[PDB]
Amino acid sequence: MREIVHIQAGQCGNQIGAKFWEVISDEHGIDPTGSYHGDSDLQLERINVYYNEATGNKYVPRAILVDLEPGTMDSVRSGPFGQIFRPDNFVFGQSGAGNNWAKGHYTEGAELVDSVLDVVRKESESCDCLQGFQLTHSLGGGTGSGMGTLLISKIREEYPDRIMNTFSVMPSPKVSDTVVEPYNATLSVHQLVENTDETYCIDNEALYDICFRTLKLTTPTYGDLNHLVSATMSGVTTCLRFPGQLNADLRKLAVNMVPFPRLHFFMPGFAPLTSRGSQQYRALTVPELTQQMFDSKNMMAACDPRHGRYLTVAAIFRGRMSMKEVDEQMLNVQNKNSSYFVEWIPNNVKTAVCDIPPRGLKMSATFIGNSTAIQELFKRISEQFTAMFRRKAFLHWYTGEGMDEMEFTEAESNMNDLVSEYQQYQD
Amino acid sequence: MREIVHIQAGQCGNQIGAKFWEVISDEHGIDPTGSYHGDSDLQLERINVYYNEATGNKYVPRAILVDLEPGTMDSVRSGPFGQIFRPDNFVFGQSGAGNNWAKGHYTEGAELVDSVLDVVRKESESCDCLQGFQLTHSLGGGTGSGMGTLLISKIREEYPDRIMNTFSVMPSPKVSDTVVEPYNATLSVHQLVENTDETYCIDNEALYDICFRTLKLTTPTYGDLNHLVSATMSGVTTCLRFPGQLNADLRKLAVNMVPFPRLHFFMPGFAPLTSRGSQQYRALTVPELTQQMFDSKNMMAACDPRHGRYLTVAAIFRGRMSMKEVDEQMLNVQNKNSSYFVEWIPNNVKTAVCDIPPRGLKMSATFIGNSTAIQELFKRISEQFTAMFRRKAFLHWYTGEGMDEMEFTEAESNMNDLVSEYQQYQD
Amino acid sequence: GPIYIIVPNGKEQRVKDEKALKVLKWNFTTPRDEYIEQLKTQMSPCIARWLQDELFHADFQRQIKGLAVMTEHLESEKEGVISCLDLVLKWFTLRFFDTNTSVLMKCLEYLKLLFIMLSQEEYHLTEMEGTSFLPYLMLKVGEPKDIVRKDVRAILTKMCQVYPASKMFNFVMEGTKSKNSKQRAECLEELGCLVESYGMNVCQPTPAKALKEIAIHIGDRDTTVRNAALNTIVTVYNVHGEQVFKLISEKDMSMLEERIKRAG
Amino acid sequence: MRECISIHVGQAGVQIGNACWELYCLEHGIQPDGQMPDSFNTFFSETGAGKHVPRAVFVDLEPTVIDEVRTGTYRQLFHPEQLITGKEDAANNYARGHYTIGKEIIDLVLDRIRKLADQCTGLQGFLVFHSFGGGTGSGFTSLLMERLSVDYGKKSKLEFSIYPAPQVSTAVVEPYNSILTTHTTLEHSDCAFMVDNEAIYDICRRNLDIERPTYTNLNRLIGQIVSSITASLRFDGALNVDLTEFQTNLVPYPRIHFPLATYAPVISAEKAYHEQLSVAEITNACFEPANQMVKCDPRHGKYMACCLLYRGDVVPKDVNAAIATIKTKRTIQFVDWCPTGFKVGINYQPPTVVPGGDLAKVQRAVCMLSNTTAIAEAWARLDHKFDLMYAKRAFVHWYVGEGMEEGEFSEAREDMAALEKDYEEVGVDS
Amino acid sequence: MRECISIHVGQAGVQIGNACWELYCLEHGIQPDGQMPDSFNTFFSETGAGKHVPRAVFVDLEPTVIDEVRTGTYRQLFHPEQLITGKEDAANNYARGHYTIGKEIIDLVLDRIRKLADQCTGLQGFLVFHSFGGGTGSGFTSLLMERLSVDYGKKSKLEFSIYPAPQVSTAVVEPYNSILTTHTTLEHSDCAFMVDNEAIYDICRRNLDIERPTYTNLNRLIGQIVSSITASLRFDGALNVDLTEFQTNLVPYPRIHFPLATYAPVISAEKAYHEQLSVAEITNACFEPANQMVKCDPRHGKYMACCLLYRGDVVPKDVNAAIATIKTKRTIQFVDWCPTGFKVGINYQPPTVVPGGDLAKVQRAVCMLSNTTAIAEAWARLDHKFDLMYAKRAFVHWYVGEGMEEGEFSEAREDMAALEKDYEEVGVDS
Numbered sequence A, B: 001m002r003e004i005v006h007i008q009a010g011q012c013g014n015q016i017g018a019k020f021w022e023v024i025s026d027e028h029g030i031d032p033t034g035s036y037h038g039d040s041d042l043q044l045e046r047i048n049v050y051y052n053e054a055t056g057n058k059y060v061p062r063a064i065l066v067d068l069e070p071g072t073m074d075s076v077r078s079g080p081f082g083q084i085f086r087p088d089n090f091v092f093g094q095s096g097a098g099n100n101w102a103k104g105h106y107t108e109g110a111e112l113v114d115s116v117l118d119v120v121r122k123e124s125e126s127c128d129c130l131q132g133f134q135l136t137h138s139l140g141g142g143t144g145s146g147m148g149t150l151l152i153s154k155i156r157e158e159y160p161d162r163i164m165n166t167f168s169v170m171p172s173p174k175v176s177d178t179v180v181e182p183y184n185a186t187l188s189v190h191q192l193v194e195n196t197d198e199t200y201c202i203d204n205e206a207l208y209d210i211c212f213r214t215l216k217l218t219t220p221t222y223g224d225l226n227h228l229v230s231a232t233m234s235g236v237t238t239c240l241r242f243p244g245q246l247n248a249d250l251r252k253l254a255v256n257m258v259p260f261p262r263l264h265f266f267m268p269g270f271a272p273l274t275s276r277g278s279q280q281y282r283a284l285t286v287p288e289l290t291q292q293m294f295d296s297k298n299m300m301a302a303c304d305p306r307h308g309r310y311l312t313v314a315a316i317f318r319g320r321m322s323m324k325e326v327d328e329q330m331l332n333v334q335n336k337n338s339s340y341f342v343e344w345i346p347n348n349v350k351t352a353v354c355d356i357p358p359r360g361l362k363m364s365a366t367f368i369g370n371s372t373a374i375q376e377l378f379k380r381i382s383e384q385f386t387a388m389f390r391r392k393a394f395l396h397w398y399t400g401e402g403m404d405e406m407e408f409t410e411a412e413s414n415m416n417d418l419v420s421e422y423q424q425y426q427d
Numbered sequence C: 001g002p003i004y005i006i007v008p009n010g011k012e013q014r015v016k017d018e019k020a021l022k023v024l025k026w027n028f029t030t031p032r033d034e035y036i037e038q039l040k041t042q043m044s045p046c047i048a049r050w051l052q053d054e055l056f057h058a059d060f061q062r063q064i065k066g067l068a069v070m071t072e073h074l075e076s077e078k079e080g081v082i083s084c085l086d087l088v089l090k091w092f093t094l095r096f097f098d099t100n101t102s103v104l105m106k107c108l109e110y111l112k113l114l115f116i117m118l119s120q121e122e123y124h125l126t127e128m129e130g131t132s133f134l135p136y137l138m139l140k141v142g143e144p145k146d147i148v149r150k151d152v153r154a155i156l157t158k159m160c161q162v163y164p165a166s167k168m169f170n171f172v173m174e175g176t177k178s179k180n181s182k183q184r185a186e187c188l189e190e191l192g193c194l195v196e197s198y199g200m201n202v203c204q205p206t207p208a209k210a211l212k213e214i215a216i217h218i219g220d221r222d223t224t225v226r227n228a229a230l231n232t233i234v235t236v237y238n239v240h241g242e243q244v245f246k247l248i249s250e251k252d253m254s255m256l257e258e259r260i261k262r263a264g
Numbered sequence D, E: 001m002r003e004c005i006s007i008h009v010g011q012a013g014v015q016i017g018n019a020c021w022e023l024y025c026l027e028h029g030i031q032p033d034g035q036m037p038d039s040f041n042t043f044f045s046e047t048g049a050g051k052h053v054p055r056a057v058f059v060d061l062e063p064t065v066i067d068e069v070r071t072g073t074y075r076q077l078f079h080p081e082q083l084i085t086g087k088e089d090a091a092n093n094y095a096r097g098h099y100t101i102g103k104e105i106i107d108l109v110l111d112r113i114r115k116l117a118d119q120c121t122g123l124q125g126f127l128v129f130h131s132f133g134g135g136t137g138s139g140f141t142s143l144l145m146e147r148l149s150v151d152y153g154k155k156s157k158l159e160f161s162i163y164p165a166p167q168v169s170t171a172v173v174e175p176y177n178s179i180l181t182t183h184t185t186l187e188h189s190d191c192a193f194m195v196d197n198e199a200i201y202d203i204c205r206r207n208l209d210i211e212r213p214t215y216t217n218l219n220r221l222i223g224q225i226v227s228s229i230t231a232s233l234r235f236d237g238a239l240n241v242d243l244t245e246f247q248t249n250l251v252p253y254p255r256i257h258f259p260l261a262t263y264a265p266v267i268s269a270e271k272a273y274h275e276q277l278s279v280a281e282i283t284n285a286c287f288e289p290a291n292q293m294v295k296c297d298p299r300h301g302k303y304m305a306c307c308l309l310y311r312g313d314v315v316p317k318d319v320n321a322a323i324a325t326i327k328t329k330r331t332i333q334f335v336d337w338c339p340t341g342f343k344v345g346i347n348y349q350p351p352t353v354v355p356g357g358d359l360a361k362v363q364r365a366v367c368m369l370s371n372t373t374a375i376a377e378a379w380a381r382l383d384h385k386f387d388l389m390y391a392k393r394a395f396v397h398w399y400v401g402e403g404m405e406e407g408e409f410s411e412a413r414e415d416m417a418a419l420e421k422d423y424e425e426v427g428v429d430s
């Protein structure tokens, strides 16, 4: 019944997905040994959306562990909640992509993608009524970029009617880790244009901004960064897992936020986000979640939504709430900020309310925003691509794996086309 | 309901604001942890005018604390009643204005005022029905004088229909603490006359005079000086917070006290003010309070009202009081001192009576007077400015931060124009 | 030498660069970097370097002496002014957002002289120049000061003959939606004086809508915004008569009748 | 039948209405929660079983005094949509109460008045309680009256106003507010009774021997006066005076509808035992100038019509003797065109005494209501104050900035002067 | 006999059905396990000994709300093949609910409806509950009513639909779905009652003094409305209104079958004690625009025919007085071709209240159902939103990819405009 197959690619994807499976197991009351230890009966009604049933009242995640380095597999297995994953789902190479999109996509990923396809087929007919897939990866590397792209292509060839979700980590020039971010990012955004039903553009710069400015966290790590993304990923699929006053699954969000098929790049956000010292001075009500969600400092992509126009915005509320208060709040943000919403879409907001709040909070909400400020994130990658590509730098690594020069020019060209489409609908 | 947003600028403004919030929390029965521990139901009935509800029965002040020195923020937070303020409302710089009006208004307050305005907008749309703002600052410095005036301009361009209240500590030549007091005072007075609905002229010379000859205090500190000012600020907004026989909000005092829009500089006063030795030899009657609050000794500005004429007078009374006795005392004051009241306004004095007295007092009175003798405070600053400006003294600090001689010339010109307006209406 | 360099087919090259999305269009709220090094790029072949490194210097004294150097060279070097008029108004839009007022008053004096010279030479200001300069000018028309107010009023007055009034009506109308109350008030009285100076054909896109958005400001919380809105309504009323009602509540409406009956 | 609807506008109106409604509840035996452990139908509506709700509406733009009513002893008497609040008060401004603030609340006030008047079938008229000096009680009262005049038409609009004193005035801009509300209550009121707070203070200190009276005692006397007005509707006696009979016998010309209120006996408990309060004595005390509820001298005016409302142990014979003795007094002179100017109503119900009140329990009581030309002196001195404060254009910018224009100030001044001129025109002999 | 079959489609329909069947269980004294410790036969079937099963079908393409029913308090009331459940929801897509996903469920729900209709010998008609903005509640309801019309024919089909509001909207593609379901409920429905969530929010906040209402209170009010519809079949009164009688007296033309529901009195418990809620007051309160269940102004329209359904301690004489007062009142105007447009039915039993509900217990209640031309303005603003969103061809690819052509959008808009033209044509006089 509406099962979700979860796929994890690269080191960043593996760590984010490990934190995500930890927070889902906390939400459904699953111990690190895989057995149910919750209190409510609502935690077991929709356990099958993410977990398979094993013998002995034990639930195993419907997750696939993909990397080209076995060290990430060892780190995931040896960590907390690492003993619940099926060992047959740990699919790994031995060499590593070497921060190369060509190696991850053509010459080294081709031998491993068949094993990943076999595993995801076994999970696909292991479930009753599959509705779609979730892939977590980053676009700055070679395994998240190359393997994930080819995997998305093969899955969409095999399952064209299912909902493709990617929680993709974008590269940003300010917090820059590697040198070849623009090449991998461009060659990947190429294929996420036509092969994903919805894409959640996540940037580490915005996550660091949350951890510094909003959370007042003096020393954020990658765990604190992945906790935010895990909260978002749990917040998106809440109405699939728990009852509510106004339910909205993945396909409903896709229908209500993709007016044209190429515009499915979103800006995720979460509310509330409290500091430890600042928690006592806040009254946990719906309107402050509404104002926190639409605040520019709360976004998990390094884009300012005030620079463009919101095409559609989603709001998945969790907890016991009044529908009237929620509806008047989302009326108020549209009326007060009418210069920030597109004019030929009346009621840009999609509203969903779930009865079950996340753990430790009595009410919460997840923001998903389809804005025209996404193009700012692609201007930066485009100009960084052009700077490296005008002087043909680092092409010999990509060309040595069988890739021609025309793949770069073509990918930059329809990236510019996607940018021009967002600019066209921005007006 | 009729909420008031409080803003503190500079060291003097922050200290007076700390004392004011202490005495307000004492009046409404709020402990330093922010929880209500009072006895009467009237203390919670109008709690929203100064406090925001938080979770777990906690009240946080609707206060914005602004300085260009983090040391004052640390001193306020480490003091008593410092744990009730919202940590997000602490907006601080790192350099300091350096007793420079230019650095406060143009150089450093210019970038910090955006964060201040964000916090003010947050508190403005957090409340239901805003009515006005309160700024506490001094005019001798650079932060409260320069940035606080710029801040006043930025609210008044955005919220122009609300009441701009300023409890401004004017400099005096007797207790003259810095060298560039005339420059900062003159440059701050000019934007007060078109951007403040009413301004309360506090003078440290008059405060020390009251603590010396009235309270018989052998060693008054800044805390004893700020206690008088805090009692005055609490006295003005009493009819908003507590029921009374005759109610009068901020707009009612502004209407009855400002005959022409540029005459809104008021000398305030408080009654009763008794020494510890002389307390038991006094009668707690309405004539005693009336005789005290109209005395030139009790004025909190360094101006002698016998040297001018009262245009309008506001008398705010607190406690279970008889209306006839109050009215006949006001009539006797106007009849016996008819030479000190202006003749083309019949019954210059406004009366308002509140049922709830201050803590530890059977009854209390607050004097607010619009006298033409307030021009003397401006003439002293004008001659001190002219002495410094004729020889171009200390101007390279102001000119080097972006200013010019010209706006000094307009500031002196229109402050002399304000003096001339008070003189022509003195007759 | 001459401070300008006339680039043959330079302005139209910039125009075809900006319409085809090769340079970033002028539409923003706060100043950023990429915009200003854009101006360092297409500003370079037009005016010589010793004025370039001083019009984009951090200190304001260097700014004011550079704009003075342009001021002695305004009359003698008008063709170079016309050749890169878009870039000099473009840098005028940059010196609006800073808090220094000496640079503001010096610039607006130079603006006054500039629109005088563009008036006497019968140059028609183009569309992209207007869209890049006018909406950024409409927040320099709401300062609390008294001489910058009147002189930017003179700027918007003396601009009327080098740009059509129908397009500038929209930009002065566009400013009536921001948060600065004073500039709503003065833009409504500006709408009033443009109505009485060019008739009814000036309002865009249709008379009915424009009379509707100059009517919601009668219900404004401000007092001088409401007074200026009512003044604009009676100003278009006294010229045209009783059809202003159909072009255009319970509180605002009665105040409108009492104002037009006491004025009439 | 014979219903009337009470309207209380502003702090003065609400605080007068509190005393009025505790007095009505004591008179009709209604407990403060509405229960009665007939004749109450004039002021109360009977709902369900054992619940009487007052036929009143309480309006103020500030919520403080209404929240006193809502959290007071009489919480259960009123239902919450009869008690209407704004957000910000009119702040002693006629323009705020009339245009800027009163227009967002006038529609809901009219809706509640319409719902309150639909359930009554014999509506005599409206009673309006407000003050001339306050912003709300002037501006919103003017707006409400000019809207009620076209919504209802020929219904009688009786109002009880707190007129500012020559000397005792609690606000500065009161002459502006009083002029700009008399400019409208001239043509939108069927009968307007002025009340002067200084006169009530003098009456309290002299008669009741109260050293320090407050607004509560003032409202108690005003509630007693209005109870004496409506006691003929509420009870029965030898001679009954309806509101239409009252207006016919008190108003000689349609602009001349400003009578003077008096009440007698106003006495204390310890002074009650010594005084033989005969009908003639309290009738004489009604005409004595220091018992007038407005600070003015009837000796320098002339009486036009005076209505005598008796209640208690009163017979018509000594009443007729009392009017005979009044007519033979030479210091009480009437106009030549009114050979008899006494409308007398005797009611059987004695006036009740509120516990904690200052008035003693008496067998008889009179509320004498004289239309006289002596009321123009208070108008003359308030116009002197208005002209003084208008010559320098003081405080005008507050009124101009809230939507009203200077021509209204002017036309109100010539309107008020024309009213005075009509008064000395009708005061002169022929 | 006199049986009715309820159909609940989508989340809105299922939750409204939960509130409705709770109300019927308390009205007929049926415990939530089907036990009772006659007149119930309209909505309930008798099974064996002391088991009452509802004559309802609950259809949704997602399993969430149906499993909430299956694990809720009323899990023993329904038997599991009345609650038909899909796997994937329609996801706010009319095309998915009509062609792609609805075809795999429609045969099963028609089989269940056929077995349910074979149980009853006196089937009055069908009650349909759904929303317009939802994918299931528009598409599957359109498919189901098409199949019901072709299978049954002359059986009446009454539907209760949650209309989208002018401003309060929860989904983006609501205008598309709403237009596409109007296109078929013109021809496949006999009487469509429109309910607007924003209007219920306003009614709850103002009348019931609820600061934060939710969907539960909305569904309780809708269930009270449907109970007032069917109480004439369920119980006996002075005047009884069958559904055929209802349609005959309310529908003047076959395309004009969109009346406007309203309920009076909606009050709280503390506001109940102060109001003498007579027949005249609640009848006047029905015609107040503030109490309308759809956000529209009836003053801008003209009433064609209205049906008054009183229940409780109601007599015909003051009912007739209430129609008399409505006829004399000018602000309610009727169309000139309907000299009498009042259908009146009085039921003896007062409406029951639910524990935890916000409605106070009342002696009398009334549901007025007016066919007026004021409904067309909500239609007009919906068409405006549809035209704005369809000018740019937004969200059309979702519909086209699921087996739908753009010509269906075009013809739905054209027929919707034709409906508006018919309403404005019958609005005018002669």
Ligand SMILES: Nc1nc2c(ncn2[C@@H]2O[C@H](COP(=O)(O)OP(=O)(O)OP(=O)(O)O)[C@@H](O)[C@H]2O)c(=O)[nH]1
Pocket: B245, B246, B247, D009, D010, D011, D012, D013, D015, D016, D060, D061, D062, D089, D090, D091, D092, D093, D131, D133, D134, D135, D136, D137, D138, D162, D164, D170, D197, D215, D216, D218, D219
């Ligand atoms: N007799 C009497 N006069 C009162 C009372 N309360 C206020 N007043 C007088 O009424 C006048 C002030 O009017 P408020 O009633 O205070 O004014 P408002 O009508 O509430 O108007 P705003 O306060 O401006 O909104 C002054 O003359 C007061 O002395 C009262 O209880 N009794």
Ligand SMILES: Nc1nc2c(ncn2[C@@H]2O[C@H](COP(=O)(O)OP(=O)(O)OP(=O)(O)O)[C@@H](O)[C@H]2O)c(=O)[nH]1
Pocket: A245, A246, A247, A252, E009, E010, E011, E012, E013, E015, E016, E060, E061, E062, E089, E090, E091, E092, E093, E130, E131, E132, E133, E134, E135, E136, E137, E138, E162, E164, E170, E171, E197, E215, E216, E218, E219
């Ligand atoms: N009054 C009311 N409206 C509701 C309720 N539940 C949902 N709605 C409204 O119905 C519309 C959404 O349609 P759902 O009924 O939620 O949609 P569905 O019919 O389940 O369709 P899919 O979920 O897309 O298969 C929105 O207008 C909701 O506000 C409810 O209990 N009461």
Ligand SMILES: [Mg+2]
Pocket: A010, A011, A069, A141, A143
């Ligand atoms: Mg790696």
Ligand SMILES: [Mg+2]
Pocket: B010, B011, B069, B141, B143
């Ligand atoms: Mg300092």
Ligand SMILES: [Mg+2]
Pocket: B247, D010, D011, D062, D089, D134, D136
């Ligand atoms: Mg008041």
Ligand SMILES: [Mg+2]
Pocket: A247, E010, E011, E062, E089, E134, E136
């Ligand atoms: Mg659904």
